[PDB]
Write an enzyme that holds these catalytic residues in place. Structure first.
Site, PDB file in Angstrom:
ATOM      1  N   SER A  85      45.999  48.111  26.025  1.00 14.81           N
ATOM      2  CA  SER A  85      46.229  47.117  27.075  1.00 14.81           C
ATOM      3  C   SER A  85      47.381  47.560  27.995  1.00 14.81           C
ATOM      4  O   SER A  85      47.279  48.628  28.602  1.00 14.81           O
ATOM      5  CB  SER A  85      46.496  45.785  26.425  1.00 14.81           C
ATOM      6  OG  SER A  85      46.375  44.738  27.373  1.00 14.81           O
ATOM      7  N   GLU A 117      36.642  41.291  25.869  1.00 15.44           N
ATOM      8  CA  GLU A 117      37.988  41.406  26.386  1.00 15.44           C
ATOM      9  C   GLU A 117      38.549  40.115  26.997  1.00 15.44           C
ATOM     10  O   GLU A 117      39.729  39.889  26.838  1.00 15.44           O
ATOM     11  CB  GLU A 117      38.084  42.539  27.438  1.00 15.44           C
ATOM     12  CG  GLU A 117      37.684  43.928  26.984  1.00 15.44           C
ATOM     13  CD  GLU A 117      38.713  44.590  26.112  1.00 15.44           C
ATOM     14  OE1 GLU A 117      39.623  43.881  25.566  1.00 15.44           O
ATOM     15  OE2 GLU A 117      38.608  45.834  25.953  1.00 15.44           O
ATOM     16  N   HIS A 164      40.361  41.141  22.603  1.00 11.51           N
ATOM     17  CA  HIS A 164      41.315  42.056  23.197  1.00 11.51           C
ATOM     18  C   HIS A 164      42.409  42.269  22.169  1.00 11.51           C
ATOM     19  O   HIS A 164      43.051  41.319  21.735  1.00 11.51           O
ATOM     20  CB  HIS A 164      41.917  41.429  24.442  1.00 11.51           C
ATOM     21  CG  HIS A 164      42.731  42.368  25.285  1.00 11.51           C
ATOM     22  ND1 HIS A 164      42.176  43.445  25.951  1.00 11.51           N
ATOM     23  CD2 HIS A 164      44.037  42.321  25.667  1.00 11.51           C
ATOM     24  CE1 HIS A 164      43.099  44.009  26.715  1.00 11.51           C
ATOM     25  NE2 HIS A 164      44.235  43.348  26.561  1.00 11.51           N
TER      26      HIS A 164
HETATM   27  C1  LIG Z   1      47.386  42.354  29.034  1.00  6.28           C
HETATM   28  O1  LIG Z   1      46.978  41.648  27.900  1.00  6.28           O
HETATM   29  C2  LIG Z   1      47.881  40.858  27.208  1.00  6.28           C
HETATM   30  C3  LIG Z   1      48.634  39.803  27.774  1.00  6.28           C
HETATM   31  C4  LIG Z   1      49.321  38.898  26.971  1.00  6.28           C
HETATM   32  C5  LIG Z   1      49.315  38.965  25.557  1.00  6.28           C
HETATM   33  C6  LIG Z   1      48.574  40.001  24.978  1.00  6.28           C
HETATM   34  C7  LIG Z   1      47.872  40.929  25.789  1.00  6.28           C
HETATM   35  O2  LIG Z   1      47.224  41.894  25.055  1.00  6.28           O
HETATM   36  C8  LIG Z   1      47.192  41.385  23.668  1.00  6.28           C
HETATM   37  C9  LIG Z   1      47.144  42.572  22.679  1.00  6.28           C
HETATM   38  C10 LIG Z   1      48.521  43.346  22.596  1.00  6.28           C
HETATM   39  O3  LIG Z   1      48.556  44.288  23.638  1.00  6.28           O
HETATM   40  C11 LIG Z   1      49.736  42.472  22.729  1.00  6.28           C
HETATM   41  C12 LIG Z   1      49.696  41.200  23.082  1.00  6.28           C
HETATM   42  C13 LIG Z   1      48.412  40.424  23.498  1.00  6.28           C
HETATM   43  C14 LIG Z   1      48.096  39.253  22.553  1.00  6.28           C
HETATM   44  C15 LIG Z   1      49.114  38.115  22.440  1.00  6.28           C
HETATM   45  N1  LIG Z   1      49.228  37.316  23.692  1.00  6.28           N
HETATM   46  C16 LIG Z   1      49.735  35.925  23.422  1.00  6.28           C
HETATM   47  C17 LIG Z   1      50.063  37.968  24.742  1.00  6.28           C
END
Ligand SMILES: COc1ccc2c3c1O[C@H]1C[C@@H](O)C=C[C@@]31CCN(C)C2
Ligand SMILES: *[C@@H]1O[C@H](CO)[C@@H](O[C@@H]2O[C@H](CO)[C@@H](O)[C@H](O)[C@H]2NC(C)=O)[C@H](O)[C@H]1NC(C)=O
Ligand SMILES: *[C@@H]1O[C@H](CO)[C@@H](O[C@@H]2O[C@H](CO)[C@@H](O)[C@H](O)[C@H]2NC(C)=O)[C@H](O)[C@H]1NC(C)=O
Ligand SMILES: COc1ccc2c3c1O[C@H]1C[C@@H](O)C=C[C@@]31CCN(C)C2
Ligand SMILES: *[C@@H]1O[C@H](CO)[C@@H](O)[C@H](O)[C@H]1NC(C)=O
Ligand SMILES: *[C@@H]1O[C@H](CO)[C@@H](O)[C@H](O)[C@H]1NC(C)=O
Ligand SMILES: *[C@@H]1O[C@H](CO)[C@@H](O)[C@H](O)[C@H]1NC(C)=O
Ligand SMILES: *[C@@H]1O[C@H](CO)[C@@H](O)[C@H](O)[C@H]1NC(C)=O
Lengths: 528, 528
Positions: free
Chosen positions: A197, A324, A437
């Protein structure tokens, strides 16, 4: 002693850790930069001054200051992402897991954590490097970097808060790996950076940025790419968001220096408490402080760099997960909730698309809606829920990555693309979210090999081949050992599914929808 | 005598004709208007002065002056549409087939021929009314009307060439039926007007036009509706086309009177020879002289009339054929030809869409292209050929008709919708054209009942039920006899397939594509 390593920065002492009833060494919390505190807040990182004596590297370091997720107090699904260490602006550390006995010159892998550029930690249980380091015999490194305003407040033209310092933090850790990993038995000429991500968009950013290219050999990008619509902003939008931040804290806004001084006087939690107030639109999948196209780290627009081949040419392995968008709809679109099937009404569908494509005019919102609506069955709540899931995923993750991979492959030296679609048997999230995701990470780090986490045997077998694919690719530039994962070519565009069933090869991953998001919609918004 | 009928216009003498080894009476070539010749060219029609003596109505009349199809000299497929009588501006006649013995007050059906408003004849073998009149016991009428410039040259504001006179010709024949059909044993209070393509758009036009409503009871529209993009133009475009016509004949263009006088001095073939030069775009499915939204025949825009319910409210039966666009691609899009499978290249596909949506900007052409391209297989020649076929059909016939039927049903008294998809076993056209525009007519007129035309037995059975559906609907407002053809409702939107297999009911005929052509694309072209 095996736990003692002398580096160019000073001696470091690690700890022995058990793994799948064996052991490896871990050097946790090694500093790679001076603490970016006080007058250094928002500033480019500074190299850590060498120390005399021995640095105790037997325990995880602090995590950077960040917004903490409270949507589901105590629910492991969301808490697994939250800082599990004290937060502090003094957080620029890295962790190394080293096979035992110490290798001489083996493959190195450096993990860059995700978290929408506003959160994240290298110390999360899902990022435990021991399983991978141990199983594939690689020296595994996890770095850290400033997130949120501390890492990305951007007042272009100022040298005090230029923007992108979180990317510079990552670069510094990569520089440190380059200069010192040989002492831990890692081969600095064979280092693969991998991330998920925001971590994966970061990996792509280091591929693009001239100042980062020489510091690594190959790259793996998971559910993220540099051109994601949420991963960067212009210097003007950056500036506007920094000023609005100051305006939320009652700061003097007359000059850059007056604003920066005020922001530097505020306690960390003060900035975190108003961070979300600066977005320009009511939106989903958008974060306040992210990388800026500054003409420095990024010499020109990401698209012109991609088009002209202005980037590191090497092998890349990347891919996406099946669902995703669900994580994001759960958190912010009306009609979705953790404990129901979240069948979505036609009205919520529409307010869902509006939230997903924030920057679109009406014609654009209609285009998206038409593209994802089954008009023979427009009131189907499952279809509306899954359609929004696809919209969010295609627009924010999948289509941007397919655009990056097609532009990259034209000039690169080898591409391997995957589509991860296994729903973990022990997922604590509702079934409607699908293959979420971030949920391929656990298979990349080998959590399914530890029985207590109670995964199935086929899930363990799946983890082992993903682990061996990633490590064999980091070591050679090819995930296959000499059934084959074919090379992705600009002609054939092949990719594989990654799941517990027999490998299946396909082509042109989500082309229909990605031609709409990468070519039609942008043309539409540009004309109207 | 059975062949002698005295009407308000004078005595008329018909002829006995054999049909499926029986006989019925036919009164062919009855005049319903003064010959629109000389100074009357372009003028509103005038009622035929009564005659003394007996009018010999034993043979077909002349056909109106028109462009004659020479694309395939002698090929029956195209010649079946060409005039089979001498052409003459003296062509305003009607034909009546009457059951024998003469009925007292039976169901009346009046056929309005198609031909893109620039061609057509009531005397074609496919329009032979004897089979239907005989089999369903109805008094069958076929009228005629001026086509091309003679029927539609429009110089709005002038009383010499006001436009729409071909529609007024049709109205005059309908007036004559209303006033005289009782003498042939037809019930003037139960007359159904039915027509195909331009004939079907005409039927819809009489439904809309205040001055035509009272002259008929019910309507059947085949592959055509009043709002088709090709069936009407604005008064300004009409004027521009009339002036350009005059400019092609070296006419004095200083005033309406100077232009009209010049056009009236030219021989018929002189206007026909340059008729096609006045179109504003390189296009397919567009014809020079067609009805004009004049504020008279059409009081306001067709859409505002449809929206406000400003139209005749009664029962309607209508529908479309499966492959409406093929006839038109064959004649004018590159890559298509009568004797090959016409697999279309990606380049020809694109010049095909440009030709099909003449009025579209680039964004619009891209929208259409994306909507009809399978991006997992973009170089499939069958897919490109069939995609263009659908584009042409959906845009010109099917979606406009689905928009009419949905607007009509809101205020009407009963709607029956069909999708005709039987490919005739003896079709002389290539297989790639499918179920072609105009090829349901032969089943409506019962040609499959005559063995020499060598159709199959199931095709005869198909013709008989379509004939009985049409006649039972003309007689009662319902095609079913008391398996059922359900009523089309604004809620359910049901329709039936019309073919040799067991009736199958479906819903929302081509909704996906029609939402694109009736709602999205127009919004797009209006914004950009
Ligand atoms: C760009 O995507 C994100 C935007 C916010 C968050 C996450 C994201 O990707 C998810 C997987 C990991 O990368 C870390 C945090 C995430 C899961 C937990 N949430 C609450 C926060
Ligand atoms: C990656 O790059 C290497 C070269 O840097 C490619 O290998 C060369 O392939 C050409 C064929 O076009 C040979 O003539 C050279 O001798 C090869 N060089 C070496 C040292 O092997 C390789 O094909 C590239 N891989 C991809 C997928 O692009
Ligand atoms: C067609 O119109 C007739 C009326 O003109 C409709 O029949 C009426 O239906 C209502 C029910 O809403 C009854 O109360 C009336 O007594 C009926 N009138 C007669 C004379 O039958 C008929 O339903 C309409 N059909 C459609 C499909 O709209
Ligand atoms: C609006 O559609 C038309 C435009 C042009 C033509 C026809 C059309 O419909 C076809 C069926 C019938 O109505 C009459 C003529 C057609 C077949 C013969 N061709 C050559 C001319
Ligand atoms: C290293 O730090 C930990 C955590 O405070 C401590 O418990 C451990 O004994 C330390 N080891 C040395 C030698 O400093
Ligand atoms: C393993 O399964 C048990 C049995 O229900 C459960 O109580 C436990 O929480 C699971 N452990 C994990 C890591 O989920
Ligand atoms: C009617 O006209 C036809 C065609 O010219 C002619 O052959 C026929 O005998 C005529 N009948 C009468 C009585 O005029
Ligand atoms: C009927 O079939 C015969 C047999 O081949 C053919 O010669 C003839 O032309 C057909 N008739 C028609 C009307 O097509």
């Amino acid at each position: 002693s095996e736990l003692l390593v002398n580096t160019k920065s000073g001696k470091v002492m690690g700890t022995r850790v058990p793994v799948l009833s064996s052991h490896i060494s871990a050097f946790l919390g090694i500093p790679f930069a001076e603490p970016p505190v006080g007058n250094m807040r928002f500033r480019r990182p500074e190299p850590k001054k060498p120390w005399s004596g021995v640095w105790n590297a037997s325990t995880y370091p602090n995590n950077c200051q960040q917004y903490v997720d409270e949507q589901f107090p105590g629910f492991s699904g969301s808490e697994m992402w939250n800082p599990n260490r004290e937060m502090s602006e003094d957080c620029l550390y890295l962790n190394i897991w080293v096979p035992s006995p110490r290798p001489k010159s083996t493959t190195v892998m450096v993990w860059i954590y995700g978290g929408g550029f506003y959160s994240g930690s290298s110390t999360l249980d899902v990022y435990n490097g021991k399983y991978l380091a141990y199983t594939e015999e690689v020296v595994l490194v996890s770095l850290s970097y400033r997130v949120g305003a501390f890492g990305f407040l951007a007042l272009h033209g100022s040298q005090e808060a230029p923007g992108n310092v979180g990317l510079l933090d990552q670069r510094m850790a990569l520089q440190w790996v380059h200069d010192n990993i040989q002492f831990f038995g890692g081969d600095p000429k064979t280092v693969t950076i991998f991330g998920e991500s925001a971590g994966g968009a970061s990996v792509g950013m280091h591929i693009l940025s001239p100042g980062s290219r020489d510091l690594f050999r190959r790259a793996i990008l998971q559910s993220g790419s540099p051109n994601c619509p949420w991963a960067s902003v212009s210097v003007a939008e950056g500036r506007r968001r920094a000023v609005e931040l100051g305006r939320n804290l009652n700061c003097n806004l007359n000059s850059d220096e007056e604003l920066i001084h005020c922001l530097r006087e505020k306690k960390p939690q003060e900035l975190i408490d108003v961070e979300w107030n600066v977005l320009p639109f009511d939106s989903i999948f958008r974060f306040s402080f992210v990388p800026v196209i500054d003409g420095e780290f990024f010499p020109t627009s990401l698209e012109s760099m991609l088009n002209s081949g202005n980037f590191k040419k090497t092998q890349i392995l990347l891919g996406v997960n099946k669902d995703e968008g669900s994580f994001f709809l759960l958190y912010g679109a009306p009609g979705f909730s953790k404990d129901s099937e979240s069948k979505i009404s036609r009205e919520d569908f529409m307010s869902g698309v509006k939230l997903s494509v924030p920057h679109a005019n009406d014609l654009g919102l209609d285009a998206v809606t038409l593209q994802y609506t089954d008009w023979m069955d427009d009131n189907n709540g499952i279809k509306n829920r899954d359609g929004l899931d696809d919209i969010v995923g295609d627009h924010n993750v999948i289509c941007p990555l397919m655009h990056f991979v097609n532009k990259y492959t034209k000039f690169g030296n080898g591409t391997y693309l995957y589509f991860f679609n296994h729903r973990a048997s022990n997922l604590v999230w509702p079934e409607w979210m699908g293959v979420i995701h971030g949920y391929e990470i656990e298979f990349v780090f080998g959590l399914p090999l530890v029985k207590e986490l109670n995964y199935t045997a086929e899930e363990e077998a799946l983890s082992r081949r993903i682990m061996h694919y990633w490590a064999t690719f980091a070591k050679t530039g090819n995930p296959n050992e000499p059934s084959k994962w074919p090379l992705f070519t600009t002609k054939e565009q092949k990719f594989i599914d990654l799941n517990t069933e027999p490998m299946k090869v396909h082509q042109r991953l989500r082309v229909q929808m990605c031609v709409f998001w990468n070519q039609f919609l942008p043309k539409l918004l540009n004309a109207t």
